[PDB]
Structure formats: C-alpha cells, structure tokens
Design an enzyme around this catalytic site. Sequence first.
Site, mmCIF file in Angstrom:
data_model
loop_
_atom_site.group_PDB
_atom_site.id
_atom_site.type_symbol
_atom_site.label_atom_id
_atom_site.label_comp_id
_atom_site.label_asym_id
_atom_site.label_seq_id
_atom_site.Cartn_x
_atom_site.Cartn_y
_atom_site.Cartn_z
ATOM 1 C CB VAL A 161 2.711 0.518 -6.806
ATOM 2 C CG1 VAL A 161 1.859 1.574 -5.936
ATOM 3 C CG2 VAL A 161 3.498 -0.385 -6.232
ATOM 4 C CB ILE A 162 1.555 4.161 -10.278
ATOM 5 C CG1 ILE A 162 2.549 4.613 -9.011
ATOM 6 C CG2 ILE A 162 0.653 5.160 -10.772
ATOM 7 C CD1 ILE A 162 3.686 5.468 -9.537
ATOM 8 C CG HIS A 220 -12.866 -12.026 19.777
ATOM 9 N ND1 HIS A 220 -12.444 -12.843 18.937
ATOM 10 C CD2 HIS A 220 -14.208 -12.174 19.835
ATOM 11 C CE1 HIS A 220 -13.455 -13.406 18.379
ATOM 12 N NE2 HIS A 220 -14.672 -12.960 19.034
ATOM 13 C CE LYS A 246 -2.539 6.331 -2.246
ATOM 14 N NZ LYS A 246 -2.004 5.655 -3.396
ATOM 15 N N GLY A 273 15.583 26.760 -7.854
ATOM 16 C CA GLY A 273 16.840 26.827 -7.234
ATOM 17 C C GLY A 273 18.054 25.872 -7.877
ATOM 18 N N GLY A 302 7.530 3.738 -15.091
ATOM 19 C CA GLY A 302 8.742 4.049 -14.144
ATOM 20 C C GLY A 302 8.535 5.647 -13.768
ATOM 21 N NE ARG A 303 7.593 9.567 -9.475
ATOM 22 C CZ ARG A 303 6.612 10.344 -10.283
ATOM 23 N NH1 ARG A 303 5.712 9.537 -11.122
ATOM 24 N NH2 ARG A 303 6.481 11.579 -10.068
ATOM 25 C CB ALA A 340 5.562 9.619 0.594
ATOM 26 N N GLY A 356 2.362 -1.076 -17.676
ATOM 27 C CA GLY A 356 3.107 -1.244 -16.262
ATOM 28 C C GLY A 356 2.245 -1.851 -15.417
#
EC number: 1.8.1.4
Lengths: 472, 472
Positions: free
Chosen positions: B190-191, B450, B57, B121, B277-278, B326, B187
């Site tokens: 979006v990205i 308006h 953004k 973790g 992709g992801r 997100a 691609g």
Amino acid sequence: SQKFDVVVIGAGPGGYVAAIRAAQLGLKTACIEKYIGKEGKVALGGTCLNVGCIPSKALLDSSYKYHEAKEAFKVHGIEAKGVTIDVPAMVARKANIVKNLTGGIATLFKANGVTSFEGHGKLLANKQVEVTGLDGKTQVLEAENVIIASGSRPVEIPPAPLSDDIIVDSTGALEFQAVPKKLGVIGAGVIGLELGSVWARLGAEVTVLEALDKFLPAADEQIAKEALKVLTKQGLNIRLGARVTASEVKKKQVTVTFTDANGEQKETFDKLIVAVGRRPVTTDLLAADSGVTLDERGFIYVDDHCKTSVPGVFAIGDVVRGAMLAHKASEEGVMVAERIAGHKAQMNYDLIPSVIYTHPEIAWVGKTEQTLKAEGVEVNVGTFPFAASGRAMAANDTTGLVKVIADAKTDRVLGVHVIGPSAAELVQQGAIGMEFGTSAEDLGMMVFSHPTLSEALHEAALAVNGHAIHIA
Amino acid sequence: SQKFDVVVIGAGPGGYVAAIRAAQLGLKTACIEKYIGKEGKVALGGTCLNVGCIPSKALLDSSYKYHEAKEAFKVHGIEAKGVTIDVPAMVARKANIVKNLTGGIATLFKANGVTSFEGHGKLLANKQVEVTGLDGKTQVLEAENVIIASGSRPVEIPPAPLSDDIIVDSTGALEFQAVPKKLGVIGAGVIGLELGSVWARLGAEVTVLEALDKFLPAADEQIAKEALKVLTKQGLNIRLGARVTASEVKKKQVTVTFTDANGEQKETFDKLIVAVGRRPVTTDLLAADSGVTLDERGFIYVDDHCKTSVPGVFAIGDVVRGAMLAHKASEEGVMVAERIAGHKAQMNYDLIPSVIYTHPEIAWVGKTEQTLKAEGVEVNVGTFPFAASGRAMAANDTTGLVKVIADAKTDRVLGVHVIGPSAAELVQQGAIGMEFGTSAEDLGMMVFSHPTLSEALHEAALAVNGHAIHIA
Ligand SMILES: Cc1cc2nc3c(=O)[nH]c(=O)nc-3n(C[C@H](O)[C@H](O)[C@H](O)COP(=O)(O)OP(=O)(O)OC[C@H]3O[C@@H](n4cnc5c(N)ncnc54)[C@H](O)[C@@H]3O)c2cc1C
Ligand SMILES: Cc1cc2nc3c(=O)[nH]c(=O)nc-3n(C[C@H](O)[C@H](O)[C@H](O)COP(=O)(O)OP(=O)(O)OC[C@H]3O[C@@H](n4cnc5c(N)ncnc54)[C@H](O)[C@@H]3O)c2cc1C
C-alpha cells in the site's frame, strides 16, 4: 412475424430493459422503436441515452474539468498556461459516447434474442400492435402481453416558442457548437440547473428564470438553501417567482419579458432554453378502442404494478405516474417483465433516489425534513460538513454537507440528504441502509474506511444521536 | 493532576478518538502525547494525520490532477498550454491541511473536556502513568483505566539504512521539495504503491523492488492481476521476488544491489524509499512490572475486546493485532471507551474495508476468492466492467471492474472487491449490505440511481446469479 409473448413499445430505459429482462426470462420478445438517431439509422436508448442522461452528464464532466483547470489548479501548485476549450470537440466526445452506447444496447438485444422492429407501433384492440414500419409498410403483431414505454417530451410554452436555434429545448442545449455569450433558462429544475451549469462553467452569462418562489421544492429545505447559495455563487443568476410573458427573437437574440415581484423586466439572451417540464407522449399510440385509459394529465392510467385497465397491457416510465427518472423506468421495466414471467416482484417507490449532477452534486432518498414536520413526525437530525472531512480536504472539495433524519421515537433512518462530493454514492449507501431498516445507530456502529468521503455519512448518523466524533 | 478515569497514551486515530468517546461518555479523561509536530509544538493526530492518511492522500490528489491535465484533458477539448507543477507549493498545501487538522482535534479535545498532557507516558504498576513531561518534569497520574495507543513505526532494514535524504522512509517521501529523476521503493504494498504513484505521476522514473512473488497477496487475485497490469502501464516498474542485498550511497545517489530470479542486478536511484513494513512501538512504554504482556512480534497482547493481561488496561490500533489501518484503530478506540463506560460494544473484525488510493483505486471488504476456494466454499461470482458504465464513460474513467462473491448455497454476499473509480464508496455500500446480510439478489432488487458508478455494484450483484442487464 405474427405472435410474441411480449411486444415492447419504446426502447428507452423502461422499454429496452423490460425487453431484455423478459427475453432473459424466456419470453419471445419484440421491441418496437422509431427514433431515427443521429447517423440516419434508428437509435435504441430513448431520451436518457440520446438526449438525456448520458449527454448531459458528459458535458457536465468536461465543463467541470475545464472549470477546475482554470479556478482550482493553482492551490495544488499546477499552473496550466492559458487553458481553452474547443466546444465542438467537447460536443463530439459526447456524440461519440452516445454512438457507442446506442450500439451497445443493440448488441445487448441481439445477444438476448430480442426481435427489434423499426417503426411507429400502436396498440389496437385485443393486443395487436400495428407496426407502421419506416417505409410505409404496415404490419400487425399479435401479442400475448404489451408493454407500452412511449416516454415523455418537452413542454412547449406559448411565450417562448422554439424558434430555430435561438429558443431551443433540452436537446438543442445539448448541441451548441459554441458558448452563448448570454443565456437564459426557463425553469430552475434539474435540467435547467444542469444545462445552466454547463454553459456557465465555460463563460456563458446565465440567468435562470423560474416561476416559483421556492427553489428545488422537492429537495430538503436545508439542502435547497445551501444549493441555491452555492449555485448563485457559481455564476447562475437564479430569479425566483419570475413569470415569462413574451419572447421576441430579433437580430439573432431574444428578449424575454417577465414579471417577478418588482413587475416587468425584460432581459435579452443570445440563446434561451425552455426547460419548464416534460409531458407523457401518448400521440398515435392507442387505437380508439384499445381499452387503455388516460388520466387527466395525459399519463396512461396504471395501478402499482403498472397494469393498465386492460389485462396483459402494462405501462412504464415517463408515460405513467411517478418520478420521471431513468432508474424508475428501468425498475418498472423489470417489475413488469418479472411479473409477466410469473414472479411477484414489487417495486419500492419510497426509495427512489434523486440526483442533480451539479458540482456540488445534490442527491437524496427518503423523506424531507418538512414533509416529516408537516406529517407531525418528530425526528432527530444529524448533519456533518464536508469541511471536517479529511478526505474532502485532501480532495480540495469541501462544500456541502450530509444530513440524516431519523425518527425520534424509533431510531429508523427516514431520509438521507447530501450536497457535496459523491452525493449519489453516499445516498446510495443510505438507500441500502434504508432498504434493510438501518437506524442511525446501526449506521454508526459500522466501520467506515478512513480517509473516505463515506465517513461524512458515518459521522452524521452518529450526530443524529449526539455522538459524532469529529464535531459535537 | 492526580486521578483520572481514563488516561490515554498516544493521540493517534485510536487514541484521540477513544479519548473523545470516553469524555463524551462522561469519564474524566486525559490523553498523553509527545509528537513535537511541524511547527515546534506537540501535534495531536498521530501517524495518520501527520505523516500518514491525510498527507499521502493529498499528494495523491494533487499529483493526479496534474496527470489528468497532461494526459486526459484533450479528449474533452481542453488544451492547457504547457502545464507545470511547483512541487514546493504542492507540498505546502499538504502541510497546511495537516496544520489545519492537527489544530482541529485539539479544539475537539477542548470542546469535549479532554485534559491533554504533553510528554512521554509510561505505564507503571497499579495503573499509574508517569508522564515524563517535555521539560524533564516528571509527574504520576493515577488512572482508574489506561488505554495504550502507542502505534507503530517503519521497519528498518539493514541493506538499506536511512541515510540522510537519500534513503528515506514514508515520512521523507512525503517531504520531497522536488521530483526525484529516478526513484526506488522497496516494498510493493500500500504505502509503496501510493508513494510510487505520487512521484511517478510527476515524472519520476519509479522501480518498486518487492521480495515476494505475489503482488498484493491480500487483495483478490483478479483485482491483483488487474491492478498490476494497470500500474505497470501507469509507469511503475514493479519487480517481484527481488531481494535487496546492498545499498551504497555515493554522489547523492544510491545503488541497490538485488537478487531476483536472474540473480544479481544493481540499479542506481536518486532517492530510495524503504517501505518494507511497520512494527508496534512499545519503547519505554511499559514499566518492568506493569503487568502488560507482549506476544512474540512486539505487539501488546490483547483479547477481542482489547483488554490486556491487567484488568483496567486496554491496548488499541497498531500496537495490537489486526490490520494496521486508521479506521480499525478508531473503532477499537470507541469499542474500548464504550465498554469502560458500561456498554458491551463488540467490534466486527470481518468487515474492515481496505483501500489503496491509487488511481484507479483498489478497495475490498469480505473474503477473497482464493480464501473461499481454499476454505472449500463454493461461490458464485459476479463481475461488471467500468467500460459498460454510462457514468464512467461520461467521466472518461473506465478502467476497472466490480466483483461480488456470493455463497452458491445461500446467496449471501461474502466479499465485494473493486478496482476503479470510487472503489471505496462502492465497497462501503457492499459493507453496509453485508453488515445486514444482503444476498446478491437483495442487492439486485434495489433501485440504484441512473447514471452513477454505484450501478456497477448493482450490475455485478445481478451478474452473480445470471441476470445482469447490461452484459450477459
Ligand atoms: C436533459 C435531460 C437529462 C436527463 N437526465 C437524466 C438523468 O441523468 N437521470 C435520470 O434518471 N433521468 C434523466 N432524465 C430523464 C430521463 O431520460 C427519462 O426519465 C427517461 O429516459 C424516461 O425513460 P422512458 O423509457 O420512459 O422514456 P424515453 O427515454 O422517453 O424513451 C421512449 C422511447 O419510445 C419511443 N417511442 C415512443 N412512442 C413510440 C411508438 N408509439 N412506437 C415506437 N416507438 C416509440 C421513443 O422514440 C423513445 O426512444 C433526463 C432528461 C433530459 C431531457
Ligand atoms: C504513509 C502512510 C499512510 C497511511 N495511510 C493510511 C490510510 O490512508 N488509511 C488507513 O487506514 N491507514 C493508513 N496508514 C496507517 C495509519 O496511520 C495507521 O494505521 C494508524 O494511524 C494507527 O493508529 P494508532 O492510533 O494506532 O497509531 P499512530 O497513528 O502511530 O499514533 C500513535 C501516537 O502515540 C504517540 N506515542 C507513542 N508512545 C507514546 C508514549 N509512550 N507517550 C506518549 N505518546 C506516545 C505517538 O507519538 C503517536 O502520536 C498509513 C500509514 C503511513 C505511514
């Protein structure tokens, strides 16, 4: 011609919309309008389109871009070497848009089968409307229903009479072919603030004199406080409680004499805008025996459905009670056309939004905190700054805040108030919420896109009840 | 330490939010995160905040303002003599926001009582999580509940392997200290579209190679058609159905070999972005006997409440099914925390909005036209162009349209689709509509301020059923 189902007087937002709706409902409709435009022919669209809503907005945008290219471009690593504004060119673009929209509602009219009449129209008794044409030719239309939408005009004030292009009104302010080196505005209301902003953004030294001690008394106190702080820091020298006593035009300048708290002061502007108010126009509108009544202030007297004292005759927009705003006039327009055709449309006066197109933009809907406190309503309120907005931060526009007020007993959202990026859209979301009854929690449980400014509406609803994720 | 009520793995949107909600709910919560940030210390926020939502953004805004200043400033009478962009300084401003947000959620955590743990973790059997600390030091927390939010990562593809700074991914694209003279993106999603726009806006020659024959197949067909039109015109050479076969890095350039309909072509970029992709990251996340399942594609298997196969363990965001967005992650984060504290929070997966932050911005919520046609739903649709928008005309932004789709039988609004100024907030108003069940007429009977872009939503709702005031 002779007979019509609806004869509409005035082609501003209340009137042209009412005319277009009644036409679509299948009423033989004629609308009367006398404003001789800017290129000699009559112009449809009224105040909003000709000297109101659309021209002030377009100047506010170009002045803003100018401002950003000069004050906020370097943080993006964008160095415009010496940017300038050609005020004539700016104003032309405005002219242009107006021209094109004016034309647009004419084609809308023809497309819907609206009989336009050019001339002054006046309501006689028994619902005949006398169209005094443009060329002296007078005519009498017989109407089953009459919709009066004559509108409003600037309040003139004695200490500052419109002298030439030195003491000018809304309209003249919209017309400067150059930046007043020093500029004064009398009235720190929507039109003052906006005309103020335009010229100040391009270099004008602005002083706004306002007779009351309270800045923006209809906006929420918190938004007011915030608004004022921002706008003064933006360059507008707003002086509250300063009463104007005299003008004196001399050597292409005018000197206003005024009393604020430490008495008399005099200040000398190159241009002075009188933006004190607006008043209904009822001028040669009603024949002595039409049956239509006026209240004490000059507004035509109407009930909740805009019906006047005589059946078949309705009044809408700035000549009747209500907020003097474009979308109130058009919705009344529609309420009235709808009812004439037989549907029991009701108009929700509690949800008219208000927007002030300053940057940051103030906007609101519902009750103010103080109305609610004075009404003895215990309310929970949530707030969310644009400074915690990721979208605002990408955007580099983090001034302002959202504020949601909810009944503490029911969690019903009572008013949404915001000053900051897209305020109009963010309150519109709250108005849609409100129209259906949202509680803060209902707003809270919804999925708002990330990253977007709409999220500050989200977080503040959450905040009404303690759980805002991104603050406390 | 040893025992916790919730132990959260990953501090992305899903993770950190869930951690903060759980903490507010009163659970002793700990969150584990290993992303060593940009200044050597661990960075909270995840993909979204560090190489995702905010950074993309912010370049999209800075590149846009540069573009406006060079292409659309003159119509306002603004002339910036020779505007330039310092890409370094641009990128730095981004770096800065991120830094400032990263730090923000750390304080958010401390403010709420969230025990952060830095290191990898791993969920062992019987819900004990082994925090392999940063410095080799291993530790085992015992958790009453475990929330896995490990995320996702760029698909890698064989014919275009990430070679140095020449073939790069989402992240490297957000890091260019200069404008690639020619640039390829594999691609056209979006990205791809968003990273493309950024460099194209500043002078890059962009080709976007995309193996499918359908542009934006999730977006409504009309918007897709419209989008494509606009974006190619904006400079992105989008080639559909082109399959990349080979890369060959040579002399700081790469040559992509691809087969589209007229076979093989080769094109030589200075930089190549693989944005195919992801994929979910499950890497050393699950001990062989944790009990947690994966589906066929790598996603952890969950039900509708994000409960995994072992009770007391939940999975959210990009490792589980759903749209990889997100706000989908954060709301699953909240659903999950809410439920562990004893509330039966349900998550509405039908209303997740989608936004692509191109200018004009695409965005939608609800079903597409073709879904509804293939589902055999007879729908009325309303459209309203930004060209009939007063506010858009003032703004000088008129590209785009709104589209409301409504069931023809009941008048329920089924999907709101818009490409144009403020698409996100306009669809967020639709979504609020939809969450409470608006029919088109309910949207229609509301008072929209308006002049505002919001009005285009109002008009197209009218238009679903015939009565749009400002068109037909
Ligand atoms: C600087 C400025 C900016 C504004 N900006 C906005 C804004 O952004 N948003 C907002 O909502 N409001 C704004 N307003 C106010 C807004 O324009 C008015 O609220 C609205 O236009 C009122 O509409 P109306 O149809 O009642 O009247 P008007 O627009 O005043 O239209 C009345 C029409 O009737 C005609 N007429 C009157 N009598 C006759 C007659 N007897 N026979 C024939 N023709 C006649 C007039 O020529 C005129 O064209 C602004 C006002 C100003 C001056
Ligand atoms: C260029 C780009 C732009 C994007 N823009 C947007 C956008 O504008 N709007 C939108 O909604 N979506 C956007 N997305 C997608 C968005 O980032 C993801 O949808 C979202 O961040 C996923 O949230 P998450 O919490 O599930 O995962 P992530 O953000 O990937 O967070 C996962 C975290 O878990 C950590 N981790 C993993 N395993 C362990 C482990 N075992 N131990 C400890 N820590 C671990 C990782 O280091 C990471 O910090 C974009 C993606 C990209 C690449």
